[PDB]
Structures are given as C-alpha cells and as structure tokens.
C-alpha cells in the first residue's frame, strides 16, 4: 500500500527501464492511472504495476 | 536578428514516442 506525496493506491513496484525527464514526476497511462513515479528524496524511478 | 510570435488557444495532438519525447504534433484547427 504505497504513498507518494499524497497519491495512495495498491500494487507492486519495480525498477524502471524507462528513461525519465528531469522535470516531471508522474507516468500516467491511457487508462488514467499512475505507472511511474520518482521518490521525492531519491532520484531513482519506479514502475507501478 | 531575433524573432517573435504570439500563442493562442489551440487544440493540439501530441505524439509521445518510445522515449517519452514529443516528435510531431498536429494543430487541430488549421485545415
């Protein structure tokens, strides 16, 4: 049960193969859900499944 | 020899690629 800056939700988290732009935070899908965040104190990027 | 133009409200279509960078777009109300 994760929490990132107030974004709740469930699911599993893994490392990101996806390269990331140094101004965004959020990966959103077609289906209007969050698949990709960055830790707000660590520049690693995680994939949400 | 600088330029200048003005932005105005437009509906646009944006093609994010594999990397997540825009590569091409279409101005929906042009033609």
């Amino acid at each position: 049960n994760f929490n990132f800056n107030g974004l709740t939700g469930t699911g599993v988290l893994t490392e990101s193969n996806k390269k990331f732009l140094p101004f965004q935070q959020f990966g959103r899908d077609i289906a209007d859900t969050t698949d990709a965040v960055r830790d707000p104190q660590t520049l690693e990027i995680l994939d949400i499944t | 020899a600088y330029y200048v133009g003005y932005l105005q409200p437009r509906t646009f279509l944006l093609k994010y690629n594999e990397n997540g960078t825009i590569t091409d777009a279409v101005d929906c109300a042009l033609d």
Partner: peptide, 23 residues
C-alpha cells in the same frame, strides 16, 4: 518583416509523463 512559423512553436503542456501514445 515576417517569416513562416513552421512547427517549432510546440512544448510539453504539463509535467505528466507519457510514452508511445497520441494524446
């Protein structure tokens, strides 16, 4: 004086990542 604004008047409109989709 005038020139043709070809296509480089475009930018990311928001801070939300997307990949491989026309949005």
């Amino acid at each position: 004086a005038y020139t043709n604004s070809f296509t480089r008047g475009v930018y990311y409109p928001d801070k939300v990542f997307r990949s491989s989709v026309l949005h």
